[PDB]
């Protein structure tokens, strides 16, 4: 998911060892995409200026 996130080839992500592939982590409930950012338009000007 992170690799698909960062489309730039200059960035390269650490490779995973065989023993580290099946390890388990906790992810967030819902991801932050452009959808959420589009909904802050009425107040975006203040944030940009500051």
């Amino acid at each position: 998911r992170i690799t698909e996130m960062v489309n730039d080839r200059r960035i390269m992500i650490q490779k995973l060892t065989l023993a580290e592939k099946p390890q388990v982590m906790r992810h967030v409930t819902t991801e932050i995409n452009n959808d959420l950012f589009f909904k802050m338009s009425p107040v975006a000007q203040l944030y940009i200026y500051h």
């Binding site: 060892t17 065989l18 023993a19 099946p22």
Partner: protein
Amino acid sequence: PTRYGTSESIDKFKIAWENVESVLNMEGNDFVKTIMYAYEDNFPKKDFYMM
């Protein structure tokens, strides 16, 4: 492989290797033994035991 767990078998194999090394041959370096020991965390336990 049907007597212990996936980790007790590894420990038993290590003990057997150390015993055999101290029984027959004089003390040395055992290049392969140290190579196996150092990178044992880069492999899952099952395939490490198989290897």
